[PDB]
């Protein structure tokens, strides 16, 4: 139903 993968990625965690 939803896509939140970018927001829980290792990349996001680094910001």
């Amino acid at each position, epitope marked *: 139903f*939803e*896509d939140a*993968h*970018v927001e*829980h*990625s290792i990349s996001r965690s680094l910001l």
Partner: antibody
Amino acid sequence: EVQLVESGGGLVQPGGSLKLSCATSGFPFSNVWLHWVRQASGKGPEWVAHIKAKSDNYATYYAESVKGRFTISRDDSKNTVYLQMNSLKTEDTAVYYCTDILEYWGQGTLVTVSS
Amino acid sequence: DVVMTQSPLSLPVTPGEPASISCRSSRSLLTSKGITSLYWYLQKPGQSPQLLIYRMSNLASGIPDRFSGSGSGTDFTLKISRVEAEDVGVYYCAQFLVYPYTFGPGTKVEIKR
């Protein structure tokens, strides 16, 4: 620097068990979603399992071919994610990757299921 | 399920010319928030898959802007404006929306000579 390091692969007999581990470092672990993805030689990637974070009550999701046999789990205090594999079949033979599914993928660990 | 398909299976490209490969999903990958859950990867032998384009059209960091992605609903296209040598490998599309998450079968891009 970001590191995802799989281990635990090897040769195992059909119907046997194996636990894969994925040790990680270099990034805050608590709110990162993680996956296991596998790949047999000459074939494309196949998603295996997905585990969310404590905030998400560690919800888990599984590929049709592994339901009831594999368990994905994580230990936030050790920045490690795991894949427990029971009742293994020859068709489970593959390289197993841990990854956030996006920019970061480990090097993979090879699992061979055979007598 | 959602099944992902791709064409062609193989694509020889003369260096410096464009490449275009297609992907299709069996249902729409638009989410309620306008995001399209479609992702493109390049995989070279012995390496893990490399993300090139995320959510249909966004270039991943460090990826040359020779790569671009577009789509209309269920049909998606990856383009390389001019092929360079490091571009060879197998290109996969994938959807991360409907929970049996799935990858396409791959398109092998080779250098024509």
